Amino acid sequence: FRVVNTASGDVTEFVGPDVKLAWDKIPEEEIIPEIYYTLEIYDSQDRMLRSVRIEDVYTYDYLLTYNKADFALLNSGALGINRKLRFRIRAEGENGEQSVGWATI
Amino acid sequence: FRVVNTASGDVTEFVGPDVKLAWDKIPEEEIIPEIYYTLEIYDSQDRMLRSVRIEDVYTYDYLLTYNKADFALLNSGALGINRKLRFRIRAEGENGEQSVGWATI
Amino acid sequence: MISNNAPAKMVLNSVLTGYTLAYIQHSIYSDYDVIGRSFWLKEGSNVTRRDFTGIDTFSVTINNLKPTTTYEVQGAFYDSIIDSELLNAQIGINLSDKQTFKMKSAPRITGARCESEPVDVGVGAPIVYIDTTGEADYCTIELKDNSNANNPWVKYYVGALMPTIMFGGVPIGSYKVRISGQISLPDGVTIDSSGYYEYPNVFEVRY
Amino acid sequence: MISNNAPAKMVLNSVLTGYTLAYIQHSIYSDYDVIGRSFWLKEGSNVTRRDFTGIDTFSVTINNLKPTTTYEVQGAFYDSIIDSELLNAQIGINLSDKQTFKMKSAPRITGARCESEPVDVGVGAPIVYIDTTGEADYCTIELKDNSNANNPWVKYYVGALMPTIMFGGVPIGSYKVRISGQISLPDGVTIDSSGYYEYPNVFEVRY
């Protein structure tokens, strides 16, 4: 679970306006076809921001529009961009259950 | 066996005044409880500088005071800071014997 | 725990104000993602915004400065993290402390007059007393023969401004004085001039 | 085999000495851990130390220069690896080669005298011969009517220094001359002046 568009020298720093989230395939895709990934993004102050399901793709991007408008307004009722974020993801299925543990940056 | 507070871009360069030495636990801690680590620090000219035993902790720091005064005076009889250093560490026990080989930067 | 710490706070080391442009000295940047600067100016009741894309330059030279006013300037840096919109809003983008700079006034004439000692006999030098009250470093003064329709302007004294500028050797006849000027900047090429300013009424030299 | 190679040797590209301050041009740094510079000065028998935290600046301007002395300056960089103590000791810290700079002397007057041709008849110009022997670029000269108790000083010539400065148009009466001056620097804002220097004894102009 690595961040695409990462800063040189130090890896804990962004380089692009939109963070690109790339992850490698879970091994058990073959056994169970109906499996998806629950990617939930947190804030700097340990407050939930997003809960998005990713399916049929092993990558995700976090658009500028999203952070700058939707999640600034609905939470802080104003315009802003949470610069410091936390991403965590796991695997789930319609009948198969959750992954053993959370995969976090 | 990695150095905390390491320089960006190139890893063979310090970034802080005090080098922080971090190492991961030896697997056989469980079997034998009475085990310690012998950390000995060398110089640029292949001359012994320190022989310090670390116990109940898996990390060590090399204070500025130490290098600037004690090991400059006792060895070169003067004030200085050996900028280039070599760190090596291994595991030992009161009854259990040494590690298979030296772990060096 | 991933973040883009915005470029550190902007400081304005030194300010040098020309007649229509100010050369401002600033600090260095960081954040690996900067685009330029966003300078805000306080005219006193109205605000303007400018942008300086490209960072290789080490200082800025604002232009189109409204004459005869003390401005407050605001320095800033911005990265692609914050868009043009948020730049207009100026939230999340770091800003500089408040500094106000004065615009040096144009070269102003305050008195023109010919005078000498009461001539007893012989030829005596008639002096020209022209008084200016502005500020510049390359002031220019020109005379023009009022009598004739066409008189190719003539410049006689070039130097620093003074409360009273006096120089002899002028001909007796009709001559009216205009005033010009320029101000230098550390940036070698740039040089700012001043508009021509002729005295409302001519004066005539006589023994 | 881990080390912090100290920042490379310090060089002083160019030196420009003001009356009380010297603007020194230097090179660029490295080592990712620098804090500032440690400039040592050789007054001739005594040494002083200064520090310049913050590296974004590209040149330095020492101040409090003791008048009329050639100083040897030592450039240097320092990182957190070496503390203030070792900085005082100056071991392990790289140092610059030895360069000595001269302080331009203050504007000095050496001769003041009125003179003209032996007047036959009529009104003739009495010239003022004032001789200065210093060095500056914006020298100022002022006259004051010695006769009266209060005489708002008057400045008549502003320009470069000269072995002999002569200008006419002065009134005949009592007038004593003071000398001032300034020196410019590439840094636009900074400008260094000189202390006022009046001639010990007045002089009187006469036909």
Side-chain angles (χ1 to χ4, degrees):
Chain A
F1 192 43
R2 74 221 178 285
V3 186
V4 178
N5 290 6
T6 182
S8 63
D10 180 39
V11 65
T12 74
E13 177 81 2
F14 282 153
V15 68
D18 291 358
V19 38
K20 189 172 308 304
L21 297 181
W23 65 88
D24 291 333
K25 186 161 44 49
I26 191 168
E28 293 82 3
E29 284 293 328
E30 187 267 336
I31 296 88
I32 49 174
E34 278 312 309
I35 190 167
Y36 61 78
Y37 297 88
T38 303
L39 177 74
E40 61 185 359
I41 301 171
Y42 272 100
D43 292 331
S44 177
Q45 295 89 22
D46 309 343
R47 291 174 292 122
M48 191 217 61
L49 188 153
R50 180 175 289 277
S51 174
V52 57
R53 192 290 295 270
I54 294 74
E55 172 64 1
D56 197 12
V57 47
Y58 295 95
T59 180
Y60 183 71
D61 79 344
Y62 188 46
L63 292 180
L64 267 188
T65 66
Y66 295 3
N67 180 219
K68 72 169 276 293
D70 307 334
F71 294 99
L73 291 171
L74 69 88
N75 186 350
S76 302
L79 167 69
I81 53 175
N82 299 3
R83 289 184 170 271
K84 178 174 299 302
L85 304 173
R86 211 180 91 227
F87 321 119
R88 65 203 264 190
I89 197 178
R90 85 197 164 180
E92 306 174 358
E94 295 296 330
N95 194 359
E97 300 312 306
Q98 297 138 17
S99 165
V100 63
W102 279 104
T104 305
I105 285 289
Chain B
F1 192 43
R2 74 221 178 285
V3 186
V4 178
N5 290 6
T6 182
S8 64
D10 180 39
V11 65
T12 74
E13 177 81 2
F14 282 153
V15 68
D18 291 358
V19 38
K20 189 172 308 304
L21 297 181
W23 65 88
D24 291 333
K25 186 161 44 49
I26 191 168
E28 293 82 3
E29 284 294 328
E30 187 267 336
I31 296 89
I32 50 174
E34 278 312 309
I35 190 167
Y36 61 78
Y37 297 88
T38 303
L39 177 74
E40 61 185 359
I41 301 171
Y42 272 100
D43 292 331
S44 177
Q45 295 89 22
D46 309 343
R47 291 174 292 122
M48 191 217 61
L49 188 153
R50 180 176 289 277
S51 174
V52 56
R53 192 290 295 270
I54 294 74
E55 172 65 1
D56 197 12
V57 47
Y58 295 94
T59 180
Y60 183 71
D61 79 344
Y62 188 46
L63 292 180
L64 267 188
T65 66
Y66 295 4
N67 180 219
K68 72 169 276 293
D70 307 334
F71 294 98
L73 291 171
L74 69 88
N75 186 350
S76 302
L79 167 69
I81 53 175
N82 300 3
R83 289 184 170 271
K84 178 174 299 302
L85 304 173
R86 211 180 91 227
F87 321 118
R88 65 203 264 189
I89 197 178
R90 85 197 164 180
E92 306 174 358
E94 296 296 330
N95 194 359
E97 300 313 306
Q98 297 138 17
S99 165
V100 63
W102 279 104
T104 305
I105 285 288
Chain C
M1 65 182 179
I2 195 77
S3 76
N4 179 308
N5 58 5
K9 198 190 300 218
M10 172 56 153
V11 297
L12 312 93
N13 266 343
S14 72
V15 189
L16 196 146
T17 314
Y19 284 150
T20 196
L21 77 174
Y23 174 95
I24 303 95
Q25 183 46 37
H26 62 67
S27 62
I28 207 159
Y29 72 99
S30 198
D31 201 18
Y32 293 100
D33 55 357
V34 298
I35 299 171
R37 287 146 289 195
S38 71
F39 279 106
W40 320 86
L41 306 168
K42 194 66 194 160
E43 181 177 0
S45 309
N46 196 11
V47 62
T48 181
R49 196 192 73 69
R50 298 175 192 278
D51 63 358
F52 296 88
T53 183
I55 193 66
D56 76 331
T57 55
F58 304 140
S59 185
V60 68
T61 54
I62 305 163
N63 294 37
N64 303 323
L65 281 292
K66 190 263 276 180
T68 50
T69 309
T70 66
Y71 283 177
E72 204 300 319
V73 65
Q74 286 268 21
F77 289 96
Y78 69 108
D79 54 356
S80 66
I81 301 291
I82 62 170
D83 53 9
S84 66
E85 190 288 332
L86 211 57
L87 189 152
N88 273 359
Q90 197 175 334
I91 183 68
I93 185 170
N94 290 318
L95 61 83
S96 82
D97 47 323
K98 284 199 172 183
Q99 268 189 357
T100 291
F101 66 91
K102 165 66 170 296
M103 187 225 80
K104 308 184 181 301
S105 49
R108 284 291 91 171
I109 185 159
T110 305
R113 179 186 66 259
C114 63
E115 195 196 359
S116 80
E117 283 267 344
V119 170
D120 52 335
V121 287
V123 72
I127 316 300
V128 177
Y129 287 130
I130 56 172
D131 301 331
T132 42
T133 186
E135 166 46 83
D137 292 332
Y138 182 76
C139 169
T140 311
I141 307 168
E142 321 196 340
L143 307 192
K144 191 193 163 75
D145 175 3
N146 185 192
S147 75
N148 195 16
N150 53 353
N151 298 291
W153 281 86
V154 294
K155 66 184 289 184
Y156 289 176
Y157 171 52
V158 165
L161 270 177
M162 198 49 106
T164 80
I165 297 169
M166 54 206 178
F167 58 97
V170 62
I172 298 285
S174 78
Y175 282 119
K176 60 164 181 297
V177 64
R178 72 155 70 159
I179 295 91
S180 165
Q182 320 198 322
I183 190 74
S184 53
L185 302 169
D187 177 290
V189 291
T190 176
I191 187 73
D192 180 13
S193 58
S194 160
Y196 284 141
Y197 186 45
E198 315 183 10
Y199 209 80
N201 187 29
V202 305
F203 66 92
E204 309 287 295
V205 178
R206 62 179 184 75
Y207 306 98
Chain D
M1 65 182 179
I2 195 77
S3 76
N4 179 309
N5 58 6
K9 198 190 300 218
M10 172 56 153
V11 297
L12 311 93
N13 266 343
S14 72
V15 189
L16 196 146
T17 314
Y19 284 150
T20 196
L21 77 174
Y23 174 95
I24 303 95
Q25 183 46 37
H26 62 67
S27 62
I28 207 159
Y29 72 99
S30 198
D31 201 18
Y32 293 100
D33 55 357
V34 298
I35 299 171
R37 287 146 289 195
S38 71
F39 279 106
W40 321 86
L41 306 168
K42 194 66 194 160
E43 181 177 0
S45 309
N46 196 11
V47 62
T48 181
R49 196 192 73 69
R50 298 175 192 278
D51 63 358
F52 296 88
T53 183
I55 193 66
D56 77 331
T57 55
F58 304 140
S59 185
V60 68
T61 54
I62 305 163
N63 294 37
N64 303 323
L65 281 292
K66 190 263 276 180
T68 50
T69 309
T70 66
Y71 283 177
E72 204 300 319
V73 65
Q74 286 268 21
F77 289 96
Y78 69 108
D79 54 357
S80 66
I81 301 292
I82 62 170
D83 53 9
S84 66
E85 190 289 332
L86 211 57
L87 189 152
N88 273 359
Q90 197 175 334
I91 183 68
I93 185 170
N94 290 318
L95 61 83
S96 82
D97 47 323
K98 284 199 172 183
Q99 268 189 358
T100 291
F101 66 91
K102 165 66 170 296
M103 187 225 80
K104 308 184 181 301
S105 48
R108 284 291 91 171
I109 185 159
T110 305
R113 179 186 66 259
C114 63
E115 195 196 359
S116 80
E117 283 267 344
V119 170
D120 52 335
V121 287
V123 73
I127 316 300
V128 177
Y129 288 130
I130 57 172
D131 301 331
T132 42
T133 186
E135 166 46 83
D137 292 332
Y138 182 75
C139 169
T140 311
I141 307 168
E142 321 195 340
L143 307 192
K144 191 193 163 75
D145 175 3
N146 185 192
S147 75
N148 196 15
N150 53 353
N151 298 291
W153 281 86
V154 294
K155 66 184 289 184
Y156 289 176
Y157 171 52
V158 165
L161 270 177
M162 198 49 106
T164 80
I165 297 169
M166 54 206 178
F167 58 97
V170 62
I172 298 285
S174 78
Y175 282 119
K176 60 164 181 297
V177 64
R178 72 155 70 159
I179 295 91
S180 165
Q182 320 199 322
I183 190 74
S184 53
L185 302 169
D187 177 290
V189 291
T190 176
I191 187 73
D192 180 13
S193 58
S194 160
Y196 284 141
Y197 186 45
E198 315 183 10
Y199 209 80
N201 187 29
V202 305
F203 66 92
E204 309 287 295
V205 178
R206 62 179 184 75
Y207 306 98

